[PDB]
């Protein structure tokens, strides 16, 4: 139920460390290693 979305090519920011990125894929690939979480189980 989205409505009134103002997105695009605006600056990016990681929700784990707070690093800035210029490329979209960069933020995604970063989230992979950027976990900061130990061995978790089901
Ligand atoms: Zn990060």
In a domain, 4, yes or no: no
Distance between CA atoms of 12 and 15, rounded to whole angstroms?
A: 10
Q: Is 3 annotated as a binding residue?
A: no
Q: Which domain covers residue 16, as residue numbers?
A: 10-42
Do the Cβ atoms of 27 and 12 come closer than 8 Å?
yes
In a domain, 20, yes or no: yes
- Those residues whose beta carbon sits under 5 angstroms from the ion ligand 1 are 14, 16-17, 34
In a domain, 3, yes or no: no
Do the Cβ atoms of 13 and 20 come closer than 8 Å?
yes
Residue 3 token pair: 């409505």
In a domain, 28, yes or no: yes
Q: Is 39 annotated as a binding residue?
A: no
Report phi then psi at 28, rounded to 5: -65, -55
In a domain, 5, yes or no: no
- Among candidates 30, 3, 2, 38, which has minimal Cα distance to 14? 30
Query: DSSP per residue over 4-24, as a string?
Result: S---SS--EE-SSS--EESSH
Q: Is 30 annotated as a binding residue?
A: yes
Domain at 26, CATH number: 3.30.160.60
Experimental method: NMR
Question: How many domains, in total, are found in the chain?
Answer: 1
């Amino acid at each position: 139920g989205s409505s009134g979305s103002s997105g695009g090519e605006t600056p990016y920011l990681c929700g784990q460390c707070g690093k800035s990125f210029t490329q979209r894929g960069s933020l995604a690939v970063h989230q992979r290693s950027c976990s900061q979480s130990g061995p978790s189980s089901g």
